[PDB]
């Protein structure tokens, strides 16, 4: 009778690793098909409840397990930084993520992984 027992619960298609730092120890977050919101809010797929992370910081959209995730910043206060090539990602502008790609949300360094590597 549970809500989740009715549904097709789709397995994770990727992983976001967060490196250890002033905010705490390393952590892995499962990423799913669709919109993975990165943000401070408790409901976010990648919930990073640090005061420097925007309530809705960024979004990693995964359309297919054979297509590159699409990263975009949601007009976060402290920005989203990519390194391919290095630059602050302007709100709305999509960035396709490669396996092992490194990104910063505010001062939190993260690395995206496929699951077939």
């Amino acid at each position: 009778q549970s809500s989740e027992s009715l549904r097709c619960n789709v397995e994770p298609v990727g992983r976001l690793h967060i490196f250890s730092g002033a905010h705490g120890p390393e952590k892995d977050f499962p990423l799913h098909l669709g919109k993975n919101v990165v943000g401070r809010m408790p409901d976010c797929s990648v919930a990073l409840p640090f005061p420097s992370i925007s309530k809705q910081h960024a979004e990693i959209e995964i359309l297919a397990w054979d297509k590159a995730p699409i990263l975009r910043d949601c007009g976060s206060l402290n920005g989203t930084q990519i390194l391919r090539p290095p630059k602050v990602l302007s709100p709305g502008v999509s960035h396709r993520l490669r396996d092992q790609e490194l990104i910063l949300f505010a001062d939190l360094l993260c690395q995206y992984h496929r699951l077939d590597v």
């Binding site: 401070r40 005061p51 976060s76 206060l77």
Partner: peptide, 8 residues
């Protein structure tokens, strides 16, 4: 709460 600014 409001997002904190990072000081550099």
């Amino acid at each position: 709460e409001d997002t904190q600014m990072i000081d550099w």
